[PDB]
Structure formats: C-alpha cells, structure tokens
Amino acid sequence: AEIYNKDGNKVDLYGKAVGLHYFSKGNGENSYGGNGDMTYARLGFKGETQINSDLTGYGQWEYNFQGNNSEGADAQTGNKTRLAFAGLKYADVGSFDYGRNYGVVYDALGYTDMLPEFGGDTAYSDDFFVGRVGGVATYRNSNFFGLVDGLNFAVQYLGKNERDTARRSNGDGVGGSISYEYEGFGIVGAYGAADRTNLQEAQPLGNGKKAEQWATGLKYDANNIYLAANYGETRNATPITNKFTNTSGFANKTQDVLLVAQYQFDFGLRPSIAYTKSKAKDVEGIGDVDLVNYFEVGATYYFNKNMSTYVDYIINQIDSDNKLGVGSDDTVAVGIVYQF
Amino acid sequence: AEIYNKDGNKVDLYGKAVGLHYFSKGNGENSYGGNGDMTYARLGFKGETQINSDLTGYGQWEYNFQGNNSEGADAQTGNKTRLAFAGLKYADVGSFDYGRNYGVVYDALGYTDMLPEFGGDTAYSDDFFVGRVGGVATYRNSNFFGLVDGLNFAVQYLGKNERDTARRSNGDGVGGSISYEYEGFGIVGAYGAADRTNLQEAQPLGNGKKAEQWATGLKYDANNIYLAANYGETRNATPITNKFTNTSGFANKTQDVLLVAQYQFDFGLRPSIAYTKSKAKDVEGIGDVDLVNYFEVGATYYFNKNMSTYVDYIINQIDSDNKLGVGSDDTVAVGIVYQF
Amino acid sequence: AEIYNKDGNKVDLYGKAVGLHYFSKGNGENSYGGNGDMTYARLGFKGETQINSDLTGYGQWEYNFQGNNSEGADAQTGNKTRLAFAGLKYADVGSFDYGRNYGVVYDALGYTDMLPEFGGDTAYSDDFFVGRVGGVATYRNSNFFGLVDGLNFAVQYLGKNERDTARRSNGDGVGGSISYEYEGFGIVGAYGAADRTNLQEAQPLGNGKKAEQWATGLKYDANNIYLAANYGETRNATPITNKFTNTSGFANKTQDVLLVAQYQFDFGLRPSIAYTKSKAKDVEGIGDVDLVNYFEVGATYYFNKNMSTYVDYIINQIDSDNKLGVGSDDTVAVGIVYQF
Amino acid sequence: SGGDGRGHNTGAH
Amino acid sequence: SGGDGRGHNTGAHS
Amino acid sequence: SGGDGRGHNTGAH
Ligand SMILES: CCCCCCCCO[C@@H]1O[C@H](CO)[C@@H](O)[C@H](O)[C@H]1O
Ligand SMILES: CCCCCCCCO[C@@H]1O[C@H](CO)[C@@H](O)[C@H](O)[C@H]1O
Ligand SMILES: CCCCCCCCO[C@@H]1O[C@H](CO)[C@@H](O)[C@H](O)[C@H]1O
C-alpha cells in the first residue's frame, strides 16, 4: 500500500497476515507438509525515486514473522529476512541491484510457482540461482534496449558465502536468463554455474568442484486461463538428506518437471491443477531416487484485492519405501489471508 | 495511526516506545517484577477491508522488541510476536478468525487487567484459553443476530501445539464465553477445557488428562469510574515452578480472585487501586500454596492520547517463607510512554 | 518519511536498504572490516506530539535487520534494536528522555563519526557513555534557557546492567557534556564515570573499580567544508581482545585521536579523508599497543536525499606483528543505499 | 502485563 | 513457498 | 558504524 509520495519519492509499505493450518495424518513427520498451526505474517517496504527523467533508484526489504511460535525461548524459530537489496535503473540501458534477492534461474521457475500454498519445490532458499540468495549482483534488461518488444535478459554474479552449514553455503558464480513474451505466450531459459565450498565438498553426498543449475519455462496467461510448464536439470545443487544413515549433501543430478493449469472465474473462484516431479540420479549408495512427486488440487476464492481464502490438497505420489525417507502421506492446507 | 484508506481498505500502523524501570531491593531475584531496565517497544498493524455492504475482512499483527538488551549475543532475548490472525464478518451473523489470538477466558479476565504495568496475572501466555495462544479458530457473535442489545457470545477451538517446552504446549480443546452489558454494568462468564500433551503429563507437578479454565467478571464503567471483579478456577492449567527443588509443571487446582477500582480525572490523572490473590490446591508435596498475593497503589497521567506517565507500587503480601519460593518483596515500576 | 500528521501528532517512519560488500585480501580474518557480503536494512519510527503550547512529547525506535544471513539457523545473526526511548520537552527548560539511547560522550565523538561506512572506532556500543547503551536517563538543555545562542549542555545517569557478558555489562555512573557553536565553528567536551561489575573486574585485562571516559571535539561546518578533530582518553573502559591467549577485557588506559576532512560538491560527489589512531597503555602482559590506526580515502555520490552510493578505502597502518593480533590488512567497502 | 484487557468485548469491532 | 512467482519479471517495475 | 554522528545534537529533540 502506497503510504508516501512527495518530491518524487514513493514508499509502498506492504504486509499480510496469513492464518494457516496444515492437516496430515499422525504427527505429520512422514508427510509432505506437516500438521498443525502454520500462521505467519509478512512486513516490508518498496521504495522508488525519480532521480531525473531517465535515472530511477529503488530499494526493497521484506521480512517473515512466524505466528506459530510461543512467546518463550522458541519465539524466533522460523523468522527470517526474505529480501533486502538496492539498485539503480537507466532508461533502456537496464537495471542493476545488489543485496539478498532471487537467483536468475528463478526467472524460469516462477512460471510454475503459482499454487495457493505449495509448489515451486525446486526454488530452494539459499540454493545458488533457483531461489532467494544473499549478495547477488544482478543486471536486468527489458525489451533489449527498446529494440524488441517482449525480449528480456539478465546476468547475475553470486558472491561466495561460507556459512556454518553446507546447505546454506555457496561459492562464486555467474548466471543468466532469457525470456520472450508475445500475446500472452512466454518462453524462458536460464542457466547458472558456481564453485562449491570446501565444507560443501567434504560432505558425504555429492561430487564435483562446480555446481550448475538450469531450467526452461513455457506459459500461457490470458483469457482467464493460466498454463505453465517447467523443465530443469541440476547437478550438485539440490539439497538432500538420507534419514536412514543421517547423512546430508547434494544430488549429483536431478531432473525436475513442473506443470500448472489454472482458471480465473469472474467472481473470484480460481481452480488449480498441478503436477510436480523432481527425480535424482547418481545419488551415492542409492542411484536414482524421487525427491518430489505429487498432483495438486486447490481453489482460491479472492473476496477482493485485500482478502482471500484457499484450500490446497497435495496428492503425494512418493513411495512409502522411499530410499531417502521422503514423506509419502498427503497434506491439506487451509488458509485465510489478509494483505495490503 | 491510520496511514492508508482507499477502496474501502484502511490500514492502521500502530506502535509505542515505553521507557520503563523496575525498582526492587537487592538484585531483585526475590521480587515480584525484578530490578533494572525494562524499556521495550511495540509495532503492529490492524487492517480492515469492506468486501461489500455486509461482508468485512480484517487482519492484525503485533510484535514486541525489547530495549533492555545489548547489541551483542543477547540482542533477541525477549523479542516475540504477540498477535497474528485474520477473519471475516457478516452483519450480526458473527465473525470467524484464525491465528494467534486471545483465548475466550480472557473475555472475563480482561475485566481486571487495567493496571498501568502489572495485573491480570491469570491471563498467562500460551496457557490454553486464558491468554495469548497460537492457532485458535474463534467464532464470535454480537447482539445475538442483532436482537438483544448488550448480549454477546463466543465459541473457540484450540488446535494442538506440541512445542519444545511443557509450559508452552497444549492439546486440542474447546471453550466459550457469554457477556451481557446494560447501562455501564457488565457481567461475563467463560469456560474452557482441553487435552494435555504427553510432555505435559510427564512433568512432576500436575496430574490428569484434561486441563480446565473458567472465569467470571462483573464491571461498572461510567462516570469516570471503573470497578471490576473476577473470580475463576483452573484445573491443571496454571504453570508452577518449585524453586527449592527446581521442578516445573501445573497446579492441580487454583482459586483466582481479582479486584480493580479506578477513577478518571478530567485533566488526565487516573488513580488506580487493585487486589489480586491466586492460591493453588493439591500441590504435590506442599498442599496449599500462595501463587500471587498483593495490593496495588498506582497513578497514570494521560498527557493526551499519545503520551502518558505512570507509577505503579506493588505491595507484595506473599509470605517470606513460601514453600514454593515465590517472591515476597515489593516492586515499584516507573514508566514514560509515547504511543501512536 | 512522515506518514501521519493529525491533531498535532506526527509520525516519521524511516528506513533504508543498503547493499554492501567488503573487500579484503584472503579470507579477511586478519583485516580491519572483513570480506564478503555485508548487506543490511534499517527500520524505525520517530514520533512527536504537541501536548500543549510549551510541553512536547517524543519517542523513537530503530531496528537493524541483516541481509547477509541465510534463512536457516543463522537468520537472526546480527539483528538488534539500536535505539528505544521516550521523553518530554519543556519550552527552554530542557528535555528529558529515558531508555536505550546514546551516551553523552558520543556528543564529542560524533564530530569525527562522519565517514561513509567506517569511522568513529571509539564509539563502542554498550560501553558506558561512548556508544549506544541501555537504560540511560538523559536531561539536555539547549541555548542555556534561551540566554546564550549556541550553548548546550547535557547530564546523564546510567543505571547498572548485570548482563551475561562482561563486554555488554556496566554499573552505575554519571556523565555530562558541554557544547558551543558560533558561525559554523564548534567546540565540545564530555566526561563520564561509572562503577564496574564484579564480573568486569574478574577479567584478566583491566584493573580498577571505576570506568572513566572523556573526549573533546572541534569542528568547522560551513561553505561545503567539514573539518573535525577529536581527542579522548579512557580508563578501564575500552574493550580489548588478545587473540593469541584468547582473553578479553578492557584497557587500563587509552589515548584516542580522530581527524576528519570532507568537501561537498554541488552535483553530489563528496570526497572524504580521515585519520584515526587509538592506542592503549598499561595493558597487563603487553604494555602499550595500538588498537586502531589507519588513513581513509573515500567518496560518496548523493544522487539525492533518498539515493546514494559510496566507496570507502581503509589504508590500515596496524603492524603485522601486533602483540594483540589486531587486524593489519586493508579493507574497501562498496555500498549502494536507498533510504526514506 | 497491564492495560491489555481494555476493550476486546466480543466480535470484530 | 507457493504463489511468489505471480509477478516476477526481468527489469524494474514503474 | 559510519555516518551516525551527523545530526544527533547535544540538546533538543
Ligand atoms: C520513567 C523511567 C525513569 C528512569 C529511571 C532512571 C534512574 C535509574 O535507576 C537506577 O536503577 C539502578 C538499579 O537498577 C540503581 O542504580 C538505582 O535504583 C537507580 O539509580
Ligand atoms: C484457515 C484456518 C482454518 C482453521 C482450522 C480449524 C480446525 C483446527 O484443526 C484442528 O487442529 C488439530 C491439530 O492442531 C487437529 O488434531 C484437529 O484434527 C483439527 O480439527
Ligand atoms: C555495491 C555492491 C557491489 C556488488 C559486488 C559484486 C561482486 C561480488 O564480489 C565477489 O565477492 C567474492 C567473495 O566475497 C570474491 O571472491 C570475488 O572476487 C568478488 O567478485
């Protein structure tokens, strides 16, 4: 919600409060999403300033407060900063921003990250170029300097972050993306490579000195219809945990497929169908394993731009004898959302 | 403070900064409130949207940042999220909201939670239906479909929360409240029962498979006078800690009594007097014990709606030889408040 | 950014998002600032209410969210509340504020705390009166009751805070400051003394039952030029860390010198040069050592009041064979800042 | 924990 | 982590 | 911790 606009500086202070509950059989330890309260809240600001007729500066911050924690010693469990960056923009030359932001490979994956609650299982946080990461310098160009309508591209540099965990660490890397949109149709491709930390290499699962992720997307968005398909392949980038021997690391190779179909009714109701399968290969000790595999049936009723309610059913196809211990039970999300 | 109001959606961004100091003799380890700096700050937003002539959506979020912590490794000690919910409303049919919100028994206990700093000792946080809790679905109706002026009722469903602590856990439960108000007079009753988690049962203090809480209140609020009285009984719900054996759990039974008297001067000064006594029964190894016991003498000066200053003296009646080690010293709070 | 102003109560909600990177040779463990991502964001509010013709109330809160942390277990690393206080003001009689606020000695040190990223190395946080501290009651008077133009003074009482760490703890103390400004020239002096906790004395470094800090500053600020000089001395107050024996504490005595020169061009670019050397004496086991020592070459380009970019190079003079293991490598900060 | 009980009533006001 | 892909785009909105 | 010394002031708001 725009709360300030004076002397060419506008500030959008936005937030939302999501009352959310997960339903799964038993305690949910063997389920896809879990069971219990999942209420959360978001706060952040989006700023944009007109430096002159052509130059434009902007900055953004976004935070996630959890509501399913007590006021005691576990109050901060799950709280985090989602985004925090700043950048500049020149007319048709492009826009350059640095900070914690999304990786370029997300440019493709977003096509299928439209579900009411779940979806986009490949857009892992702090996972190279597929999700929100820290310290990424990103240059983006729209319409190729104003020469082609619908043609956009981006190039990104990922700085090294040697953290205490191999999951949340990364080395230096570069990536890019290309996208074309014409009359509601869209085609996208994105690729990224980066080094791996010593801590990451020392882990039992995964092999190699470089990690690489790439994905491609095709969508149709028009006439109240939304269709999207994503295919991506990753090497030494997807995090995995073997629960039987309690070992962690990365999959040497994964094949990821995402499908989404959605319709938008005039009065608000939005039916949703989706398919998602991520399959790993060359996993040390197992070979091939299924990481994600399900169909989705969900509906979202938009009362208006500020309030919504959704129901999301995940029909889990994972085998009960998964060789990595992946959950095999279904999960039902029920949410009521206020947002501004 | 209302910062946005367009298209039938208003957003109130509210906060406060409370510079606060507690005074007690010695280190304050044997006191009611403690000793030292207690400054803190609050932030939150309350959103309300007019979906149509009758339907109304709303959401709320509130956070507590502490100011008495250093910028070092203890910076987050005491920070927490107080509220986080969203709901809908139909003309007189009622309102349904889910998330972290107040328990129904607070409807009664709130009558006596009017002191400047202390008071309302029975509305424990994360304690079933008497205080702020997580994941409560609440249906509330006013005026019984618009037929009786002053008659309101509420029914609430409390979801399971198995947390890392026995104090902050709870099972499934249900509760309700009814209230009638006529010509400044108000009567309220509220009751709640719920299951107990295995972790809660495994604790040395307390016995049973269900926890029970109920309270009733009577108030007069008019002519600058506010009188309120609360009586309530709890079963396996009040948290207790034996400091001599360093054990925790819940009181098998408690009798709680709250009394409050207040006057409001035209120019701002509001004197306040209160009494509070909570006594436990069936305590393993001790029998009957005093949990809370004090008189209160305090004054709050409202400079205006945004600024206030108060002094609160708690004359503690707890016995110095209390068999649970409950503090017996007095405590005086001094506060200066800005709020918006 | 002022977001509310009705009935004489205005609320300024201000923030900034700083994309920041530090550059140092190698891993940066032996450097002044470090190496890697340093992105961060700030949020806060400043409130002011007109109680009557003379009385004025105010309050403030500020928080620092880090952007260089992952969404995993270290999401809260470095987050803290910088300020949190409330106070009142009477026309020419003075202003009193309590809470977590700046120590009085910062009044002097602020003269030389003008660099884009670094600087003000003596204004340690939670270190008696030289930086942001908790529970400080501060009375300040401007223009000596309106009789002398440019003459200001302040007196501050710091309450004891027995924290879990010796670094972030402090006892009771008193301090003050005096300042005079005429035609862009400014002279300032400030002094403060305080007790030390038992835990503080038990540390191997530092000896005594009193902590003492005083500083003096001289500046000229006009005609696009800003020159400033600071000299200060501390006794049993400056934190010190011996990395070779893994011991920490305080220097029995320190002599601090700060110098700043800056120019402001009409089109925005602001060159900056500075010098800073703090040297401790009477350190048990080492004697005399240099804690801080460097020259600075830096520039800040102000696109406007809301957007800026800066580059800060620290030429570190610390010896590579420093007897306490203090960093000796250079550091270059590069930042892009949006703010409102 | 004082002053929080004011208002509330029942229902979303 | 669903619904975030709704309006992600290359470039800076204005 | 740079840029914080600007403003502040020894007295008044
Ligand atoms: C409205 C807030 C008033 C601010 C109180 C400033 C006085 C600080 O209070 C101090 O507390 C210390 C123990 O905690 C003791 O040294 C003394 O009781 C007192 O000097
Ligand atoms: C959009 C939010 C809908 C609110 C859901 C209200 C139903 C509460 O859900 C309850 O939670 C318990 C686990 O905590 C389960 O054991 C119960 O089966 C379930 O009924
Ligand atoms: C104003 C912010 C500029 C963004 C800096 C983008 C360059 C990223 O910086 C990178 O950091 C790595 C370790 O941190 C180094 O190993 C690389 O040499 C360096 O290119």
mmCIF file of N, CA and C and ligand atoms in Angstrom, chain A residues 19 21 23 36 334-336, chain B residues 96 98 137 157 159-160 172, ligand 2:
data_model
loop_
_atom_site.group_PDB
_atom_site.id
_atom_site.type_symbol
_atom_site.label_atom_id
_atom_site.label_comp_id
_atom_site.label_asym_id
_atom_site.label_seq_id
_atom_site.Cartn_x
_atom_site.Cartn_y
_atom_site.Cartn_z
ATOM 1 N N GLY A 19 -3.556 -16.621 8.248
ATOM 2 C CA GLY A 19 -3.969 -17.687 9.135
ATOM 3 C C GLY A 19 -3.979 -18.995 8.376
ATOM 4 N N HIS A 21 -3.401 -23.451 8.436
ATOM 5 C CA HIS A 21 -3.363 -24.718 9.155
ATOM 6 C C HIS A 21 -3.093 -25.851 8.178
ATOM 7 N N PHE A 23 -3.107 -30.030 7.594
ATOM 8 C CA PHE A 23 -3.753 -31.256 8.048
ATOM 9 C C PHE A 23 -3.050 -32.445 7.412
ATOM 10 N N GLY A 36 -0.529 -29.060 11.865
ATOM 11 C CA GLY A 36 -0.646 -28.138 12.970
ATOM 12 C C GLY A 36 -0.826 -26.723 12.474
ATOM 13 N N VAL A 334 -5.171 -25.149 4.616
ATOM 14 C CA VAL A 334 -6.363 -24.310 4.691
ATOM 15 C C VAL A 334 -5.924 -22.940 5.183
ATOM 16 N N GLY A 335 -6.225 -21.903 4.414
ATOM 17 C CA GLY A 335 -5.710 -20.579 4.709
ATOM 18 C C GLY A 335 -6.753 -19.497 4.534
ATOM 19 N N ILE A 336 -6.653 -18.486 5.394
ATOM 20 C CA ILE A 336 -7.417 -17.249 5.287
ATOM 21 C C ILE A 336 -6.415 -16.106 5.374
ATOM 22 N N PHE B 96 -15.484 -14.888 12.160
ATOM 23 C CA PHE B 96 -14.639 -16.070 12.279
ATOM 24 C C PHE B 96 -13.214 -15.653 11.951
ATOM 25 N N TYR B 98 -8.877 -16.870 12.550
ATOM 26 C CA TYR B 98 -7.916 -17.901 12.913
ATOM 27 C C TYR B 98 -6.519 -17.303 12.989
ATOM 28 N N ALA B 137 -9.149 -21.131 16.337
ATOM 29 C CA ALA B 137 -10.272 -20.752 15.487
ATOM 30 C C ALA B 137 -11.412 -20.275 16.379
ATOM 31 N N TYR B 157 -12.133 -22.883 19.184
ATOM 32 C CA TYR B 157 -11.486 -24.184 19.044
ATOM 33 C C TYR B 157 -9.976 -23.978 19.074
ATOM 34 N N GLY B 159 -6.293 -25.530 18.613
ATOM 35 C CA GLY B 159 -5.569 -26.603 17.965
ATOM 36 C C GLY B 159 -4.384 -27.120 18.767
ATOM 37 N N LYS B 160 -3.937 -28.319 18.390
ATOM 38 C CA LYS B 160 -2.835 -28.971 19.085
ATOM 39 C C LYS B 160 -1.528 -28.237 18.811
ATOM 40 N N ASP B 172 -5.686 -30.394 22.063
ATOM 41 C CA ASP B 172 -6.939 -29.943 21.477
ATOM 42 C C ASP B 172 -7.912 -29.552 22.582
HETATM 43 C C1 LIG G 2 -7.983 -21.420 7.535
HETATM 44 C C2 LIG G 2 -7.730 -21.925 9.002
HETATM 45 C C3 LIG G 2 -8.800 -22.950 9.381
HETATM 46 C C4 LIG G 2 -8.760 -23.187 10.880
HETATM 47 C C5 LIG G 2 -8.709 -24.728 11.202
HETATM 48 C C6 LIG G 2 -9.627 -25.027 12.427
HETATM 49 C C7 LIG G 2 -9.593 -26.508 12.724
HETATM 50 C C8 LIG G 2 -8.485 -26.819 13.733
HETATM 51 O O1 LIG G 2 -7.823 -28.046 13.334
HETATM 52 C C9 LIG G 2 -7.619 -28.994 14.290
HETATM 53 O O2 LIG G 2 -6.139 -28.967 14.632
HETATM 54 C C10 LIG G 2 -5.643 -30.149 15.332
HETATM 55 C C11 LIG G 2 -4.132 -30.102 15.259
HETATM 56 O O3 LIG G 2 -3.655 -28.894 15.814
HETATM 57 C C12 LIG G 2 -6.128 -31.472 14.723
HETATM 58 O O4 LIG G 2 -5.799 -32.527 15.599
HETATM 59 C C13 LIG G 2 -7.617 -31.487 14.507
HETATM 60 O O5 LIG G 2 -7.963 -32.694 13.764
HETATM 61 C C14 LIG G 2 -8.092 -30.321 13.732
HETATM 62 O O6 LIG G 2 -9.531 -30.333 13.735
#
